[PDB]
Amino acid sequence: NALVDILPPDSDSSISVMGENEKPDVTYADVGGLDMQKQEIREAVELPLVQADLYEQIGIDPPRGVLLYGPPGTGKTMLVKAVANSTKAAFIRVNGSEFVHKYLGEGPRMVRDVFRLARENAPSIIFIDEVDSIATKRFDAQTGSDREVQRILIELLTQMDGFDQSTNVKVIMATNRADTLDPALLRPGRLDRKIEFPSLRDRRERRLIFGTIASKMSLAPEADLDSLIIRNDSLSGAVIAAIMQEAGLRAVRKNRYVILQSDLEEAYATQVKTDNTVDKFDFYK
Amino acid sequence: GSRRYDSRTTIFSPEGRLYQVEYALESISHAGTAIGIMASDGIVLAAERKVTSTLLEQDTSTEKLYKLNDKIAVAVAGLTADAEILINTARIHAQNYLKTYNEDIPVEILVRRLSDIKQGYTQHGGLRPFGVSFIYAGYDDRYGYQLYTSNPSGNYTGWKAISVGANTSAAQTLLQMDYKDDMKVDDAIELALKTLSKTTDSSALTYDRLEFATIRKGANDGEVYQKIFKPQEIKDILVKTGIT
Amino acid sequence: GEITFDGIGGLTEQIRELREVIELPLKNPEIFQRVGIKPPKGVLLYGPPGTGKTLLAKAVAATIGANFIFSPASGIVDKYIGESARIIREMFAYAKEHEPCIIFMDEVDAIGGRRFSEGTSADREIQRTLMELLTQMDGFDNLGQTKIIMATNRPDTLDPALLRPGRLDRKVEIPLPNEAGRLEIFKIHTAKVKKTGEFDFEAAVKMSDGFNGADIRNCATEAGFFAIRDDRDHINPDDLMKAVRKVAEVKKLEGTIEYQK
Amino acid sequence: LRPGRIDRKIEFPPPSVAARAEILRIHSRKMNLTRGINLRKVAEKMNGCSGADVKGVCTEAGMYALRERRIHVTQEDFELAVGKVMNKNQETAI
Amino acid sequence: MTDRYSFSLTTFSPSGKLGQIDYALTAVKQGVTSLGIKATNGVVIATEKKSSSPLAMSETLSKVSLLTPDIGAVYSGMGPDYRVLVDKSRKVAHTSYKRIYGEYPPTKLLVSEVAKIMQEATQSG
Amino acid sequence: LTKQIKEIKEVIELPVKHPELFESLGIAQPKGVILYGPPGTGKTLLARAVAHHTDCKFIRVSGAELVQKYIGEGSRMVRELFVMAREHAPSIIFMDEIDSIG
Amino acid sequence: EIIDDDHAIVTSPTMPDYYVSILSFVDKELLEPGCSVLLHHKTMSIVGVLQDDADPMVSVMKMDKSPTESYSDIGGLESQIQEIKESVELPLTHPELYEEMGIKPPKGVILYGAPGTGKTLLAKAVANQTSATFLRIVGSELIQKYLGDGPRLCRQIFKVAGENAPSIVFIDEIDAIGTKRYDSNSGGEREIQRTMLELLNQLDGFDDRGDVKVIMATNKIETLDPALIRPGRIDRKILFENPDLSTKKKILGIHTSKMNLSEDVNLETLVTTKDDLSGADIQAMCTEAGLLALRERRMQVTAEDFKQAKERVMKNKVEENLEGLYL
Amino acid sequence: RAVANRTDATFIRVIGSELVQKYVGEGARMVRELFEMARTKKACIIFFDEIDAVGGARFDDGAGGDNEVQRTMLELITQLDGFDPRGNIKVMFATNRPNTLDPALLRPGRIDRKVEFSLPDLEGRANIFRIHSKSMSVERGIRWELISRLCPNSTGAELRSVCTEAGMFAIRARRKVATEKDFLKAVDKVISGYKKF
Amino acid sequence: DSRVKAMEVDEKPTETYSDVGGLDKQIEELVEAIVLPMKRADKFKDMGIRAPKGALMYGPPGTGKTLLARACAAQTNATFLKLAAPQLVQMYIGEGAKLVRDAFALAKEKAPTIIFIDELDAIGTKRFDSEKSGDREVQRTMLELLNQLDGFSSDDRVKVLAATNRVDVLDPALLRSGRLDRKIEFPLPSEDSRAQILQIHSRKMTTDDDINWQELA
C-alpha cells in the first residue's frame, strides 16, 4: 500500500471513443469540392502548429478557436478530421455523450481532464463534435437531471476562456444549428474565426466534386463527362452523392460496370417532391 | 367558438397598472429618440429617424415630424400605423375649434381631448390602446410656449424638457446638466444635435437620419413661424458644431 | 420466427428494392468495390399501421439468415440521462461480432423530433441519441457488413436530417396493397383454412377494395369464427362474403392510416 | 441580492472609444508597429463592446502580414482586418 | 349573426409589438418573389408567374391590377386578400377622390389611404 | 477601462494591508465584492492583476464542489470552504459561480 | 435502546447492528439512550461512557450563560418587543397570574416578516431578561445527506431543553429546511421528511414540555410545508413591521456616534431631510459615509461628509427601482 | 371517545403520524401486534388515527419512489378479509381526506360507513366557544353568539386560541377577570393574520 | 417485488352470469368472443385462423364490466390477473414503461390466463403536434402496449380484455378493428333491466311485498 512507481498524467485518459481518433482514409473527397474551405481550416489550424517559427517572428498570439456552422451535409466533421489525421499532431475526439452522466459531479471531472490532457501532449487538437446538445437557450432545474446538463455547460465556459494563449489550437466545435448557443457568452476572442459553409455553390465548385466521382469508374461514352455538370444548377454535394449512389446500383443489373449517363439523368430528375407548389400557391402566391 | 375564448383587455388590473399599457412603453423605446427642449422664445424639437437602410429614400419621406398647423408640430415615437389615425384626428380638431370661436385652439384643450380618446379604449372600448407617445409642441398667446407629452395611458404632463423614445434617461440626464433655465432658442439648437449623437451608437449621426423643426415668436411683426428644416439645412449646422 | 419468402408477396417491386440495398452488398462487397461507389446503405421505411412493416423487416432477416436485433427505441429511453447514449453504442458494436447483422430500429420516431430541449432533460436526451446515432452511421467510420434499417410511422415527429440525401439509396413508401396484391394475400389465407372449396374471393375483393393488409387477415378471422359458431368444419362461401360487408364500413370510418415523408 | 449583504456591487461599463485605444496600442507593440499610424483609424471607425473585439483586429492584422513575410503592418492590412471582424459581429447580433 | 367577440383579438406581445402583425408578415416572406426598380423615366415591376398546372390557362392568372389608369400595383403574399383590398381601394380612391378634387389621386395620396385601411383591419375585433 | 482599475485598488488592497486605516477613515470592513459586466471585459484579468500586488494566495475555486468527490460528499465541502480558507490564509477566495444551474 | 437484562442494541461505524452485552462499568441507569458510548473493539461491550455526544453540533447548541444582548439597548419597536415578553417571559417568571385566570399559559411565539428589522436580535434580548437557559441552533445542521443521523440530533434538542427547564429553544433558520429538496428526480422526500417529523413528535412529547418555550425565526411558514402543530401551542404570532419615522431616530443615533464629528448635524434635522426608509437602510447610509471618506482621503470625517452621504444613498435606492409608470 | 364512553366499549388509541415505526414494514409488525390483541378483547374500539402516514398509500406513483408504507398497508388488507365477524369490535380509521387512502381499502366490505365531518354552523360553533370560555373566569353576561358571529366558519382549535389570547390580554392589564373586550381583540388578531394565507 | 405479487393471481370463486342483472345483449357477445373459442379451440387451430385475441368493453361505469370478466376467467379455468393502468404509470418515466413489458412475460408462465387491463383513460389520446407532447410518457406507453398485442409474439392464446370509459378519449392507433377484436358498447338500463338489478340487491335484505320493484324502476 505504498508509492513504488509513478504514471504519466497521460495514463488513465478521460472516457473516450473505442475506435480510432485517427481517420483511415486519405483518398479524400475533402479535397475535391469544398476546396476553398479545406484551405481555410488549414490556415487557422495546420499553419500555427507546423510553423511555430513564422508566428514567433511577427509576434502574434497563436490564432483563435474555430466554430463550424452551416447546414449539415457539408461534411464539416470530416474536412477537419482529414487534416488532423495527415498532420500527425495529436487528436482527441470526444462527444457530449462521453461527458454526459447520470450522477452528481461526474461530468465536470472529465472536462478538466480534456484541457490538461491537451496541454501535456502538445501540439494537440481538441474537437468536440456534439456541443449543440449541451448548450441551452434558458437554464432549468424543473427535474433534477437538468441541473447536471447545466454543470457541464458552465465548467466548459470557464475553462474555454482560460485556454487562450496556449500553443494548442483552441477548441474547434461544430454545430448544425446555432440557435442553441447564446451569442453573448460564446463570442469572438475565444473563437474569432467563425467559418460559414455555403450551399449556393458554383459551376466550378461542383465541377471538383464530379471529378472525384468520375475517377472511380469511367463514365460511359453514351454522352460526354460535361453532361452531369449542366443539370445541377445550385445543388450541394450531399445530393450529388445520393444521385451517383442510385445510378450505379441500377448499372449493376444491366451487367455494365460503367454508370450510364441515362441513369444519372433519371436519378437527378427525381427527388423533386420537397412540398410541391399546390399547397403554397393557394395562399402564399 | 367566440363565447369560450377571451382576449379581454378591459380587466381592471390588480396592480392598479394595466399590463397592456406597460408593454407599449417598451415598444416606444425601440423607436428613435425625440427631444423637446422648451425655451422662453420657442420650442426646439428634434427627432432622429430609426431607419438607416440605404435603398430607402429617407430624405423625402418625413415620418416623425409632421406639421399640424402654424403653431403646433408633433413628434412621433411609437407605432407609425397607429400614429397616422391620430394625426388626422388631431388636424381636424384644431380646425373645428378655429372655425367655431375664431381663435387658434389653446394648446391645453387639444392635448387633453386626444389623451381622453386613448383612455377611452381601455375604459370600455374593448380596443387595444394606441402605443404612441406624442410631444405636442405648441404656442398660444396667453400662456406663451407650452410643452406637453402624452402617454399610451391617456395622461399628459407638462414639462420644461422631456424625452421620449430611446435613451430617455441618457438624453434627460445631459439636458439637466447642460440646459439652464435661461438658455435661449439659439443655444438649444446647438445643444440638441450634440446630445442626440452622444446617446446614439452612431459615430456621427448624419443629417439624413435627423429631423429638426423650431416654433418661434422671434419671427418679426408679432408673428409665429414654424419651419421643418430640410435635410441639407440640417447638414450645414451639423458641420459647424463639429459632429461631422 | 421465420417469415417464408414465398409468404411475403403483395407488392413485388417494393420488396425487390429492400434486397438490392441489403442482400447484394452482404453476399458480394466485390461488385460495389469494382464500381467504386460506397456500397448501398440506409433504408427508410414508412407506411400505415398494419401494412406488414414488421413482417417485412423480419422477412429479410430470415431469408439471408443474417442475425437479427429487434429493438424498439421506446425501449432505449430511461429516466436518468446518458443511459441512452450507452444503449445504442453497445448495440452497434454488438452487431459487429455478429456480422452479418441488421439492426431493426422500430419506432425511430420515438427518439426523433426536432427542437424540444427546454422541458425535462429527457427532451435533451431524445436529441442527443439521434445526433450520436447519425455520427455512428457516417462521420466517424463507415457502415460495414452491419446495416441499419430505419422504420417510422408517426408524421408529427419527423426529422429533415434523417430524410436528407447522403446515406440512403432508397426512400421506400409502402402504400395500400394492389388490386391483386390483396389477391395474393387472400390466396395464402384461403390455402390454410378448411373449405368446401370457396370461390367467392373475386367478389369479396371488389368490396374490400383499398384494404390495408390487416383487414385482409381480419375478414378471414371474423368469417371463420362464424363458420365455427354455425357448427362447421367448413367456411362456406356464404360466410366469407358476409364478413366483408361488415368490415368494409367500420374500416374506412375509423382508418388511422398515416403516411410520412 | 439583499443590499449590503454582498457589501459592494461593481458594474464595468462597456468600453469608451478612448478606453479602446489604450488596449489596441499595447498588443500592436507586441506584433510590429502600425505604419502610418492607423491605430486611431480603427477607434474612429467603431467602438467595441469588449476587449475581445479589439484583440480580434490585432490577430487578423498580423495574419495578413504573416502570409506575405513582410513584417510591416500596413494600412492595407488594418483595413481588411477591421471589415472582416465587423461583418462577423453583425451576422451574430442580427 | 355576429361573433360574440367584443374586444380586440390582437394583443400586444408581453415583450411589446403585436402578435398578429408578426404573424401576418411571415406570409409575405414565404410567398413568391417580386422586385421593382424605381427609375427617372419610369418604374419596372416584375414578378414570377409560374403555371399552376399546364392545363390551367396561364393567361388569366394576374398579379398586375389597376387602381387608376395612371397607377398600377403588384403584390406578394396571400392572393385572395389582395383581390378584395384592390376593390376597396378603387372605391376609397375614385368616388371620394372625385368629390373632393375630380381627378386621378396622386401616388403619395393613394398610398396613404391604403395604409389606414390595413390598420383598421387589425384593430377591429 | 480606467475608472474600474483605480477604483478596485481601494476596495481590495487596503482591508488586507491596513485593516486599521480602512476602518478609521471609513467604517468596519466589507462583506465582499461582486464583479459583473459584459463577458470579454476581462473582469477576470482584473481580479488576477490586483492579486499580484496584494501578494496573497489567489485560489480560484471555480464552480460547485459537488465535482469533488475525493472523500465524503462534495455537498458540505462547499460549506467547509470557510474552515480551509482560514487555515490557508492569506487568501483571496475567488468564488466564480454564475448561478445558471437553473 | 437498552433492554434490562444487561444487553443493548448498538450501531458502530460499521453498517450492521449488534446485540451486545453491557459489561460492568456504567450502570444502566447512569446511561442515557441516544448517547455516544465507549465499545471495546475485540468484543463490543459497553466499557463506559465519556463521550456524551462528542460532536460539533453539541458545541454550537449549548449556551448555559445568558446572551450578549441586554434588554432595550435596541432602540424602537418597543411595543413590538413588549409583546414577545407577554407570551414567553411572563409565564416562566410568574405562572400564578395564569393559574388565577383559569387559562393555560401561552407557549411559543413565531417571529415572521421581513429582513432588516433585526428579528433575530429581539429574540436574544427578551431571553436575556428572563435569564432562561437559552439554547440556540442553526437549522442547517439538523439536515444533512447521511441517513438517520438527522432525527437523533433533533430528539436530543428536546431532551436537553426539558432537563434545564425553564428554558427557551431558539431554532434559527428553520426556513432553511423549507421545501428545499436535494434533487428533483428523487430523494429529499426521504431524509428531510424524517427530521421534520421528529421535532414535531417531541414538541408536545411523551413528557409535558409546556415549560419549554420555542421561538422560531422564519420568513414565513409558507416556505416550510405547513404543519406547526398545536396553534395555541405556538399561540401568538408576531408580524414585524419595518421601522417608521420615530423608530429610526433611535437606531440612527447609535450609527452617527461611530462616524467622527457628525454630532454637528442635529439629530432631528438628519431624520427630516431624508426620505422615510427602514433602519436597514440607515446601515447602508452609515456605510456610505465612510465609503465617501475613503475616496476623498478625508482625513477626519466631517459634517460635510454626513450630509453628502444622504444624497448618494437615496439616489442608489431610486436607481435600482424600475419605472413601470403609475398610470 | 364520546361514543366509546356511552356504548361501554373500551378505547385504544394509536397514532401513526407520531409513530416513526415504519421502516420497510416495521409498521407491518406493529399493526399486526396491536390489531390482533384488540380483536381478542370483547367490547372495544380500535382507533388508528392519521393512517395517512404509516399504513399510507404507496408513493411509487410520485417523485420520491417510497414504498416503506406499502408494506404496512399490504398487511392491513389481509387482516380485514373484507367483512369479517368480530363480535362487536369496532374498526376505526381516520384520514384527512378518504381520497388519499389506497383504492383496494376503499372497496366495500372493509369499510361499511363513510362520514364527512365539516366545520359547523354558527349555533354549534357558539357551543364549542361556549365550553372553553366557561372554564376561564370572565365578566358574566357574555354573549357567546356575538363572538362567534364575527369569526367566519372556523376550526375548533381556533376557538381555544381566541380564549387563550383573551385570557392573556386581561392579565397584561392586571384584570384577573377577562371582560368581553378581550374576546373581541383576540378574534381580530388571530383572524387577520391567518386568513390572508 | 411486492408490486408484482399484488398484480398476480387473485382469482376468487365464480358469481355466475345469472347474477348480473338484465343486459342480455352484452353477455351473448362476451360468451361468443371468448368462451366458445376456448372450448372449440381445436377447429380454430386446424383452420389455422387465429383464435380471437380480446374483448374491448366501453360504456357507463357501473355496468358490471368487472363482474363480467371475472366470471368468464373462472369458467374457462384461466386466472384472473387484475391490472389497472394508473398504477403502472409513475413519475419515473423509465420505470413505469418497464413494468408494462414485465407484466406480459409473467402472463406467459401462467397460460392460460385472461389479462384484464383497466382505465386506459390513463393513456388518453395521442393527437400531439406541438412542442409539449406530455413529455413522452403517454406517447411512450401507447406504443409499448402495441408491442405485447403484436401477433407474431403469442397473444392469440392468452387473451387481453380491456375496459375504459369512452373511446373518444382513447388514442386512434390502438383502436383499430380486428386489433382488440370486437368492440362492445354497453347500452343503459331501459326500465327492464332496472327492476332486475334492484331485485337481486334486495334479496340479501329481508323481502316483503310492501316493496314494489316496478314502481321504483
Ligand SMILES: Nc1ncnc2c1ncn2[C@@H]1O[C@H](COP(=O)(O)OP(=O)(O)NP(=O)(O)O)[C@@H](O)[C@H]1O
Ligand atoms: N468536402 C465535402 N464537400 C461536400 N459535401 C461533403 C464533403 N464531404 C462530405 N460531404 C457530404 O456530406 C454528407 C454527410 O457528411 P457529414 O460528415 O454527416 O456532415 P455534416 O455537415 O457534419 N452534418 P451532420 O450529419 O448533421 O453532423 C455526405 O453524405 C457527403 O455527401
Ligand SMILES: Nc1ncnc2c1ncn2[C@@H]1O[C@H](COP(=O)(O)OP(=O)(O)NP(=O)(O)O)[C@@H](O)[C@H]1O
Ligand atoms: N405482403 C403480405 N403478405 C402477406 N401478409 C401480409 C402482407 N403484408 C401484410 N400482411 C398481413 O398484415 C397482418 C398485420 O400486420 P401487422 O404485423 O399488424 O403490421 P405493422 O404495419 O408492422 N403494425 P403496428 O406495429 O401494429 O403498427 C400480417 O399478420 C399479415 O397477415
Ligand SMILES: Nc1ncnc2c1ncn2[C@@H]1O[C@H](COP(=O)(O)OP(=O)(O)NP(=O)(O)O)[C@@H](O)[C@H]1O
Ligand atoms: N481588455 C481586454 N483586452 C484584450 N483582450 C481582452 C480584454 N478583455 C478580454 N480580452 C479577451 O477576451 C477573452 C474573453 O474574456 P474573459 O477573459 O472570458 O472575460 P470576463 O469579462 O471575465 N468574463 P465572464 O466571467 O464569462 O463574464 C480573454 O480570454 C481575452 O483574450
Ligand SMILES: Nc1ncnc2c1ncn2[C@@H]1O[C@H](COP(=O)(O)OP(=O)(O)NP(=O)(O)O)[C@@H](O)[C@H]1O
Ligand atoms: N428595533 C430594532 N432592532 C434591531 N435592529 C433594528 C431595529 N430596527 C432596525 N434595525 C436595523 O436592522 C439592523 C440589523 O438587521 P439584520 O440583522 O440585518 O436582520 P433580520 O431581520 O434578523 N434578517 P436576515 O438577514 O434574514 O437574518 C440593525 O443593525 C439596524 O440597522
Ligand SMILES: Nc1ncnc2c1ncn2[C@@H]1O[C@H](COP(=O)(O)OP(=O)(O)O)[C@@H](O)[C@H]1O
Ligand atoms: N349489472 C349489474 N348487476 C348488478 N350490480 C351491478 C351491476 N353493475 C354494477 N353493479 C354494482 O355496482 C358496483 C360497481 O360496478 P363495477 O363492476 O365496479 O363497474 P365498472 O368496471 O363498470 O366501472 C358492482 O360492484 C355491483 O355491486
Ligand SMILES: [Mg+2]
Ligand atoms: Mg457532423
Ligand SMILES: [Mg+2]
Ligand atoms: Mg409494427
Ligand SMILES: [Mg+2]
Ligand atoms: Mg471572468
Ligand SMILES: [Mg+2]
Ligand atoms: Mg436574522
Ligand SMILES: [Mg+2]
Ligand atoms: Mg372495473
